[PDB]
Amino acid sequence: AQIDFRKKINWHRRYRSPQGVKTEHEILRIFESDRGRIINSPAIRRLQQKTQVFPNAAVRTRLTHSMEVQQVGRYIAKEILSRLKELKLLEAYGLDELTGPFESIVEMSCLMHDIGNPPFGHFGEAAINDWFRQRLHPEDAQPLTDDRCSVAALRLRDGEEPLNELRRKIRQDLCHFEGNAQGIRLVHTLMRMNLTWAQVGGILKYTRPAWWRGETPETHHYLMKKPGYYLSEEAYIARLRKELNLALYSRFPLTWIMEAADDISYCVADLEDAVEKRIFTVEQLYHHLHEAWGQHEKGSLFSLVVENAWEKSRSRSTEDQFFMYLRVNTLNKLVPYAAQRFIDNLPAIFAGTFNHALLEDASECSDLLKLYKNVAVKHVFSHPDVERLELQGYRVISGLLEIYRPLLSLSLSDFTELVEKERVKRFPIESRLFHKLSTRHRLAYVEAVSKLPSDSPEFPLWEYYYRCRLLQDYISGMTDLYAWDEYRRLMAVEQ
Amino acid sequence: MAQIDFRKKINWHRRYRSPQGVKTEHEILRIFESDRGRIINSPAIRRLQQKTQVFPLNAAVRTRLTHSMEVQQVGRYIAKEILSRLKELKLLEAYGLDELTGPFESIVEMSCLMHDIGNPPFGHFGEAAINDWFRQRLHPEDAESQPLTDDRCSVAALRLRDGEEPLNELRRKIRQDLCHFEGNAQGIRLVHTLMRMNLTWAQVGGILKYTRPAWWRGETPETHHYLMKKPGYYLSEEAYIARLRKELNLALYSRFPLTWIMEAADDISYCVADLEDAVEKRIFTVEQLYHHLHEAWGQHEKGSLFSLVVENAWEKSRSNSTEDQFFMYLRVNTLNKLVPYAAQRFIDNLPAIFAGTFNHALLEDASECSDLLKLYKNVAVKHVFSHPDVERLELQGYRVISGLLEIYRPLLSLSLSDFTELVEKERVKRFPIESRLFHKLSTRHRLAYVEAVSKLPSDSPEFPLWEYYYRCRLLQDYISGMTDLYAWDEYRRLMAVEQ
Numbered sequence: 001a002q003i004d005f006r007k008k009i010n011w012h013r014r015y016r017s018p019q020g021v022k023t024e025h026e027i028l029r030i031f032e033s034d035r036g037r038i039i040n041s042p043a044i045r046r047l048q049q050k051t052q053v054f055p056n057a058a059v060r061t062r063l064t065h066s067m068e069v070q071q072v073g074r075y076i077a078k079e080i081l082s083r084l085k086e087l088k089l090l091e092a093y094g095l096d097e098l099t100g101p102f103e104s105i106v107e108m109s110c111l112m113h114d115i116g117n118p119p120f121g122h123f124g125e126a127a128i129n130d131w132f133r134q135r136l137h138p139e140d141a142q143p144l145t146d147d148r149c150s151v152a153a154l155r156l157r158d159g160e161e162p163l164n165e166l167r168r169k170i171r172q173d174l175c176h177f178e179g180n181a182q183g184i185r186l187v188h189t190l191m192r193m194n195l196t197w198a199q200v201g202g203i204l205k206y207t208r209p210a211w212w213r214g215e216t217p218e219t220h221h222y223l224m225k226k227p228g229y230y231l232s233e234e235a236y237i238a239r240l241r242k243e244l245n246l247a248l249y250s251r252f253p254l255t256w257i258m259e260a261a262d263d264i265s266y267c268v269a270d271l272e273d274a275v276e277k278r279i280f281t282v283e284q285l286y287h288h289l290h291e292a293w294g295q296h297e298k299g300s301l302f303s304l305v306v307e308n309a310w311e312k313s314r315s316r317s318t319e320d321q322f323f324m325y326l327r328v329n330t331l332n333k334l335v336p337y338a339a340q341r342f343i344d345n346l347p348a349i350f351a352g353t354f355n356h357a358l359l360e361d362a363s364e365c366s367d368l369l370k371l372y373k374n375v376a377v378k379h380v381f382s383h384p385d386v387e388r389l390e391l392q393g394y395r396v397i398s399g400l401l402e403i404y405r406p407l408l409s410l411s412l413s414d415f416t417e418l419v420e421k422e423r424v425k426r427f428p429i430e431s432r433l434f435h436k437l438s439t440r441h442r443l444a445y446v447e448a449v450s451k452l453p454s455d456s457p458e459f460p461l462w463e464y465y466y467r468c469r470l471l472q473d474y475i476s477g478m479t480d481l482y483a484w485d486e487y488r489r490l491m492a493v494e495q
Numbered sequence: 496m497a498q499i500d501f502r503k504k505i506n507w508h509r510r511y512r513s514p515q516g517v518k519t520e521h522e523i524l525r526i527f528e529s530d531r532g533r534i535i536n537s538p539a540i541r542r543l544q545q546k547t548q549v550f551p552l553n554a555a556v557r558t559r560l561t562h563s564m565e566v567q568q569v570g571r572y573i574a575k576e577i578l579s580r581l582k583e584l585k586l587l588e589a590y591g592l593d594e595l596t597g598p599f600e601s602i603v604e605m606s607c608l609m610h611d612i613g614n615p616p617f618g619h620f621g622e623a624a625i626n627d628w629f630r631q632r633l634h635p636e637d638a639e640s641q642p643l644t645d646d647r648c649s650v651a652a653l654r655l656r657d658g659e660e661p662l663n664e665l666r667r668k669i670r671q672d673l674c675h676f677e678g679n680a681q682g683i684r685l686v687h688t689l690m691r692m693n694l695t696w697a698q699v700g701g702i703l704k705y706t707r708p709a710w711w712r713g714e715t716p717e718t719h720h721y722l723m724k725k726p727g728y729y730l731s732e733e734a735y736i737a738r739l740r741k742e743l744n745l746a747l748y749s750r751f752p753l754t755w756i757m758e759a760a761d762d763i764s765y766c767v768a769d770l771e772d773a774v775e776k777r778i779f780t781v782e783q784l785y786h787h788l789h790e791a792w793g794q795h796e797k798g799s800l801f802s803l804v805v806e807n808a809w810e811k812s813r814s815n816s817t818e819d820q821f822f823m824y825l826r827v828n829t830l831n832k833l834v835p836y837a838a839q840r841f842i843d844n845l846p847a848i849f850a851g852t853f854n855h856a857l858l859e860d861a862s863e864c865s866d867l868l869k870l871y872k873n874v875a876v877k878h879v880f881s882h883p884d885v886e887r888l889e890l891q892g893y894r895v896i897s898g899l900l901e902i903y904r905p906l907l908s909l910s911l912s913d914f915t916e917l918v919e920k921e922r923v924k925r926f927p928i929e930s931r932l933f934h935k936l937s938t939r940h941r942l943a944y945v946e947a948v949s950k951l952p953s954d955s956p957e958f959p960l961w962e963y964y965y966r967c968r969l970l971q972d973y974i975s976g977m978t979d980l981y982a983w984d985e986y987r988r989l990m991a992v993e994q
């Protein structure tokens with residue numbers, strides 16, 4: 001009915017939660033604790049070894065990117081906050097004592113959107129999903145006696161009907177690995193950071209279950225674009241919506257802000273990087289921009305942003321000057337536009353239902369972002385080198401999956417034996433493969449499986465699910481270099 | 496009964512195109528935000544992600560960037576605790592900080608983020624290499640007082656000729672200064688002359704960690720021994736630093752307040768991180784570490800600092816993976832005892848820290864806290880930095896930087912006219928090698944050279960000296976600007992060891 005941010009900035013935790021009535025200061029310190037938790041996480045440093053667009057120190061990695069993004073998100077936050085202050089609406093919306101947490105949650109959400117991304121990015125994603133799709137064929141789930149699923153337990157046997165449904169969800173879910181979903185899993189089950197509910201909400205960018213099949217509801221198309229959470233994170237996400245008063249398939253407000261921030265940074269950075277990596281020159285870039293635009297009315301957005309960037313940078317290095325100004329001008333037009341977009345739609349963004357991005361529009365601003373994106377896609381991401389690396393990464397991840405396949409091939413009893421006894425005599429290979437998986441991952445497997453009723457007819461299905469989930473955890477946790485090196489060492493191509 | 500007005504220290508003016516007049520709280524906030532945007536998007540910061548911290552680059556092992564980032568958070572924590580400790584004492588308004596909370600914390604955070612910015616490849620050993628090479632060329636020893644017959648300086652213009660006395664002094668300062676390359680001094684130079692970020696005066700003050708001129712000779716004043724420990728600025732940054740002290744009301748050889756905060760932060764992060772890293776890189780195990788700590792400490796009054804911090808970390812860990820738990824708790828406990836102690840230390844000495852004269856660190860003490868930091872440091876120095884691998888890499892880096900210096904030596908060997916000719920004509924016919932070497936130097940560096948030299952009166956007897964100075968300064972700029980990997984690869988390429 002209203003807008004009360006005290007009911008959205010939830011400073012409680014999942015375990016050992018702070019309790020009762022807290023002062024402004026004590027809430028501030030709670031969210032500070034969240035900051036210290038995240039910044040000192042292994043997952044963040046691991047970001048410094050994952051590649052952004054290219055694989056050259058001045059070229060950005062997911063860390064320095066996430067860091068520039070952090071600053072853009074903070075800028076947007078502050079502008080929203082003080083535009084609400086100028087409208088004398090802070091107290092009205094419950095934000096008068098939550099300024100700190102507001103900005104901080106945005107900054108940290110920015111800092112860790114990339115946290116759950118696999119090696120080689122979208123192509124590691126691809127590789128994983130294609131491999132598993134070849135093994136599980138979620139397409140074939142009415143039952144067929146020619147069901148191409150290679151896994152005994154997950155085939156649809158005619159008769160058993162609830163079990164068939166669980167089989168459906170398991171197949172689809174395992175075949176929809178996604179970076180964001182993996183990030184929720186990572187932040188909850190594998191790292192056990194025990195963040196505030198608000199922070200976790202800040203991560204949850206899409207709201208579609210990975211096990212989802214068919215067309216998504218019309219009114220939620222944008223929010224259910226990609227999978228947001230896995231079948232295993234389900235009860236946790238339910239709990240999360242309960243704690244942040246989110247409707248089914250709805251989103252946490254602050255997310256929009258960070259998402260906006262993301263877009264902005266990445267766009268200009270990519271062009272800059274393309275000029276460091278020599279893919280095209282500055283004047284050439286200015287030309288591709290000027291052409292792709294095309295509608296030059298006197299005093300439009302392109303003139304201000306791009307053409308003024310270009311005009312200044314020609315008289316102290318010209319390339320750096322041009323991109324500095326391009327970033328500045330872009331930010332100075334787009335950040336307040338995003339802010340205003342947020343405020344003008346605050347009721348629906350607060351309900352978590354608003355089916356649009358802040359910078360998705362017929363706006364000139366939106367068109368400017370699309371301009372940048374087009375120029376990059378046409379003349380940067382098509383650079384033969386970028387594509388070589390994409391092909392390579394796909395082979396490396398497909399290959400690691402093939403190497404560890406022996407573990408997914410074991411029977412329930414055999415694998416359980418392997419988990420319990422540690423070193424099994426009649427499975428030398430599978431044993432050593434198993435020990436190569438990370439400790440945290442194996443613990444997560446053990447914990448998940450131990451929570452299941454072992455006499456239930458569902459048990460073998462859930463176990464296969466959590467085993468595949470173990471393998472995907474392990475592979476998607478690697479840095480590009482590590483995944484590559486592991487693939488080459490295991491393939492006996494190097495020592 | 497001196498004064499404490501932070502409005503007179505948090506200077507939000509700039510060197511060029513400065514904002515002017517009477518600004519509101521909000522407009523000042525935006526000024527310092529601008530500073531943040533300036534620094535975070537600098538090439539120098541990303542270059543930090545490719546320079547090594549203690550070990551070489553695993554992923555979970557820290558680099559100067561992720562370190563500087565963790566440091567950023569510790570510095571912010573200390574800042575906030577000082578600020579709200581002053582708020583609880585009802586002293587913000589009293590000290591002029593009531594409208595400068597944002598800038599305070601922000602200046603600390605960004606100073607933390609870029610202390611490492613001016614560091615050479617291979618760290619202290621790149622530093623070593625540079626200074627040793629140049630010392631072999633300039634022998635600043637022979638220029639103390641009294642000119643000499645046997646003056647081993649290989650550079651014609653900078654030998655002390657008996658008679659010319661002002662020139663001899665300038666010669667002295669040039670030799671010493673070129674032979675005292677330092678990361679912090681290079682950072683001031685980097686932030687002013689090479690990057691031209693045009694930060695607020697307060698921010699630049701935040702960088703200036705030591706206050707000794709690199710050209711300094713002899714014992715440093717007794718009352719300033721800690722602040723003049725290492726060189727803080729180069730002979731070329733001199734007029735800038737003068738201007739800086741004028742804008743931040745600093746006495747000669749004095750320091751900017753907030754610096755102490757960041758310095759404290761630095762120490763803390765690095766200490767625990769290193770031990771953690773040593774356990775990732777397998778140098779020793781956790782239980783072994785606990786043992787080396789417990790031994791280096793001494794007996795217990797089960798309730799002393801070691802008990803709380805380390806022993807509670809170890810126990811809380813033991814109830815279980817174990818490694819990560821132990822180091823998480825170790826960091827938490829250390830921070831929770833040391834950060835407020837640092838904060839308190841800052842507030843209890845605020846008059847002298849504000850005067851910029853306070854001759855101590857916040858965590859340099861007979862304090863138990865201080866002793867705990869020293870404990871960590873000792874354990875690392877004995878059982879981590881002595882790991883044969885770390886030392887291999889130190890030796891290697893020294894060879895690489897010594898070698899790059901030898902490769903570019905032909906440029907320092909040219910005469911004034913010849914090098915000038917090379918700068919102006921670009922491609923000179925009778926110097927194929929030197930020409931190509933020159934073009935390999937970075938554009939920003941060469942521009943800085945040209946600008947510096949153009950500022951000089953060309954008919955002055957000082958001119959050839961200043962030019963040689965700014966030329967050496969050009970070479971040191973170029974070499975210290977490299978990442979470890981780049982310096983290494985360039986050295987190998989240029990040596991024809993690979994393509």
Ligand SMILES: [Mg+2]
Pocket residue numbers: 113114262266
């Ligand atoms: Mg991103």
Ligand SMILES: [Mg+2]
Pocket residue numbers: 610611761765
């Ligand atoms: Mg440091």
